[PDB]
Design a protein around this nucleic acid. Sequence first.
DNA 1: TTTTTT
DNA 2: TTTTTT
Lengths: 66, 66
Amino acid sequence: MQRGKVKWFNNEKGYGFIEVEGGSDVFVHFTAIQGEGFKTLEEGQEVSFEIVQGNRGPQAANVVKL
Amino acid sequence: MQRGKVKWFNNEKGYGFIEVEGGSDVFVHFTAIQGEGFKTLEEGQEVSFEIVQGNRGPQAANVVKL
DNA sequence: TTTTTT
DNA sequence: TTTTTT
Ligand SMILES: [Ca+2]
């Protein structure tokens, strides 16, 4: 196990490097990253969903990218 | 269940709207989105990790944002 | 990205 | 975002 700080990361390429004090940078591919990822939708994305009603209006539930 | 097409989604705000044929747009909060999210690292992020050797050299495994 | 239009 | 330097 090692501690480091992300040197840079490129979201188009899916990788970057971690800097380590007194050592070489370490390559990181996105698939190695733990934890929940960032949830987003792109303009034009086809989706299925359920409609529900909240106190501020209707909204989508169970939104699946088709 | 309904189908639609994302009209716009704002990553800073964490929400957007889904267009549906013949109906009002439907609001979508990011927390309603299903599937794995986008895995990324931000420059300067402190991380822990393990090192493994692939056929192009060492790389990080089990990368956790601290 | 933490809640109703762009 | 699909694999070694911004
Ligand atoms: Ca307006």
